[model samples]
Target: MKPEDVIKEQCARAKVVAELWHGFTGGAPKAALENLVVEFNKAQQGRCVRPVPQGGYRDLSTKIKAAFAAGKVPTMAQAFENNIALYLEAKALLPIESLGVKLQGVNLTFLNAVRFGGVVYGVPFNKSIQVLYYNKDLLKKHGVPVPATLEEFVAAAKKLSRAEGGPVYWFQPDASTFAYFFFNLGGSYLKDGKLVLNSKEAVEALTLLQNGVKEGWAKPITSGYINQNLGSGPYAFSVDTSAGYTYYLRAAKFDLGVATLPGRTKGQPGYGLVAGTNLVVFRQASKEEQAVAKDFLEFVLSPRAQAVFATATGYVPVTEGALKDPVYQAYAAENPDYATIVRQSRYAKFEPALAEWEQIRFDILGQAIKEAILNKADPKAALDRAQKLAEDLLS
Candidate 1:
């Protein structure tokens, strides 16, 4: 359905329907998400599930803000760990702890990614870890071997870049993903509930990209997702979330392979971002409507549903059974590429679940990305300004 009609249909549905606001555009991600809703609606044959497609994370945030103000929020919406703060401020969400789900069979580690301050607001609907996606053919043609360390990756980028379609690596504006580079080299964004973006380690991390751009090998993403450029053969590598494997696979005409986010070495620390949307109930939903929402949520978290979601895309299944499911086991064997993502679950890192982190996230930290990458600004200078801006937002 059209976007304008989707907004109107929220309240005008013939009968009760739970509207789920999700951040999936084109490609396998949207297809997989829509399939589950269709399958669920089919079996129920009564109360229905209809998904309202929002553009991306940024778009979801903007629309939801307007929606809550307009008192037109959906029964349920896909949010992030950080967005919980504003919803709580507005009292627009219902805590799931009252639902009596001890999060049974859910991995505590994965649960920690969304849980904050002893309160659970949502379920880990679809979670992802960062992976180093490389064009196998490009590497072979350029005589560049797989990079296992920062040093190796830099050398490879230098070798693989040419004069034209020559950004050896496509860098995106994600603060969480940037955490891996700094944390891998030993840096912390928080301490004693304070922002700390100007540390020595932080400067070194930012310089990693500054240097890459200065060398004429690494370029910032011009627009849209990284694959939009990487697919066209101008790019050789991208460190993106694992859930993006579907698009990466569909986009690349050449062979694509994934490995755990590259680290300093075998023994040194290496980190990757873990990011995805969560399903949260709305305050405006009726108790009966909320009950139906929980039932559907429970089913979504089931082993079968988790397995289906994971297999259809690169999202790591949140349940242990899904990992051990005979179907996933067979799929893992056949597709070692995707299996690499599931295996890297051990080191995936989550952003701080702090209040007001949403404002600090793309707005504050993204400036650091633009400064060092686009403007060739000093790393320490960029981080200093970001640290102050983050402090203001937090304060």
Candidate 2:
């Protein structure tokens, strides 16, 4: 039977309402969920199951938490790695490890982050890794080979940038992109659980970014312009998540190539920031509701469902069984570009899971990188200011 039909059968047998919530920016979980629903109804002997889709991830989290406070939380909702800390703080999430052994293979790197004092509070759903998306045609026209290091990448950007012909290709160095660059260069914004953006590595990384702009190899764009550039093709390359491949393929008429984000040197680890969403059950749900949530969770992890979800969303499947699915394997064979992302997944790193990460990212690193890239301050000075501010926040 189809995965959705199986879900419907289980839901009917259990007499439970299946609720699904998804994040807007994450992989296409809503579409996957919808497909599951359709298939479930088609395969069921009788119409016995139904699922209600809810608001976006952040909004749903807010609603669910409010409901929990008033003792009326939803049975299921969406969450992210960062917000898992907040849910744990609010005491509004249920421990999934207590449910059963079905979830034993859940990625520990993800699980450890959402765990509070050794208790797993969320189930990982979608996962993405950052990658370098380059326009092969543009590179050929500019006579530049694919870059293997930061220095080579900057040189290629310089060659691609146009001074009079309406800027054929421009490099974009924004805060988050800069962070990924720094991480790939073996730099960390934190050390020994303390803020360290002012360290030598951070300063060096920012200097490289600033140099890209100052030398006309790159341009700084407002956050809104980042997406615009991605679609417009005026930029030859972008360091963004692999999930974007779906949109890029749909939008760009030219061939898009995927490569590991350029490293500081060959053989050095190339790092990509992990991006995606998680599933969290509200603490206020009844035991029966929790059981229902567990059933849905297991269904999602099943080989069939995982393969379909990964294929539709361009997200790396979180379940081990997903790796063995013929559908996903065929898709990988047909599109080697997508396989680059899966291969690069081996080097993926999650952002710091501290509750204060949002503040640190926005108030400190974001502003500092902006100032540095815009030449309002020297890269070292800007990063030093950020480091000082982050140290205070962490303290």
Candidate 3:
């Protein structure tokens, strides 16, 4: 029988099902994710794969928690470095690259990002960093030059907002996305293994962000949420994950532009947050299912798959070889930012993968940002409260 018939026979007889849970809610990336699944199923000679998606990151988080409690976890799920820690703590994660994942083609830095306790737990599925996304036509219409320094970024945002009559910059609310601002401006989320959110540099950065909101220059939006209205012109500029560039393109009525995140001052590298999902298999699956799951992963890491993903979405390919793909090169030629954005990896910073970091980030630091943006609370005072809360929560 033909290979296609053999795949169908496997799906219908004596084979296991590889189930996947992902956080894709519908976009270019989501479609690309599902397409890979379809291809994996069609090409497989052994088991079949099924993909299920939750609404968002938090939605998947809550669902997986309950699933683990009830012993109903899927064969695999998409998780981040820290979130993967939670899975491993529960003793559910499987080591990756067990199949034909072709790890030699993957960037070591990306492979290193998914490592926990010296074991590579997963692989980069859709990795990207924060890139400044602006409406090219809008900026030109208002005579706003692409900003390179924080001073110029703020000045330009004000001008764009004045012309639009509302906040033009969709400032991100996620801790990882905002980490770039605080760290680049001379502060960090942690220092000497202690929470230092209230440090002078950190507080100063938040104040600038809060001041922008007060001045009618920025509106708060989560990193993922900015793509929805990017092309509609509710905001003229946003610093968000580069993965959404294709999503923005679908909705863009005018020209969309991308740039490296602005530095705090001239002659300084602007820090960017590395963001994306890591694919991990669970311990609950049968060995056969686990074996097939590896096939699904290997398919995801293949050059053709990664190239299509990077070309369809703005996310960088996992390896430099993927960049050499004609499909990616063609896209890069049209969107020069694709070339420059990947080079910004030099200024990239990753989120803390420590277990306690998830709570500290969302419940503490993330909430403090809310207090400042929503309640008009003092940035320093808000951060001070968060530090106190972190001490008690972890105590």
Using lDDT as the measure, the top candidate is 3
What TM-score does prediction 3 earn?
A: 0.90
Least well predicted 10-residue stretch by lDDT in candidate 2: 163-172
| Tens-place lDDT digits, model 1, residues 1-395 | 73334434433542667788888875777777777776666556466667888888779978999998798888888888778767887888888868655477776777776565677888888888888888788888877787888778877888888633466787775575577677878777777767787888888878887787777787778587787765554677788888889888877888997877778786632578788878888889877677667777887887778888888889988887787777788788888965787777777677776767777777878778677778877888888898889878766
Top candidate by TM-score: 1
- Please list the residue runs of candidate 2 whose C-alpha ends up more than 4 Å from where it truly belongs after superposition: 1-15, 25-29, 37-71, 162-175, 223-227, 230-233
Each model's Cα RMSD: 3.1, 4.2, 3.6
What are the runs in model 1 whose C-alpha is more than 4 Å off?
Answer: 1-15, 100-102, 162-165, 231-234
lDDT (C-alpha) at residue 289 in model 2: 66
Cα-based RMSD of candidate 3: 3.6
lDDT of 3: 0.78
Instruction: Arrange candidates, best lDDT first.
Output: 3, 1, 2
Locate the minimum summed-lDDT window of 10 residues in model 1: 2-11
> What is candidate 3's lDDT per residue for 1-395, written digit by digit as tens?
53334444556653677877888777787778766766777776656876667778778878889999899888888888888888888988877755445677787888888888787888788888888888899899988898988889888999888888888888766576568778778676668977666888878877878888889998887444676656444567888788877777776777888888789777855888888888888878888888887777777777778888877777778876788778878877887877877877667888777666777888898999888877889998998998899788767
Estimated TM-score for each candidate = 0.91, 0.84, 0.90
- TM-score ranking from best to worst? 1, 3, 2
Model 1 scores a C-alpha lDDT of 0.77
> What lDDT does candidate 1 reach at residue 29?
72
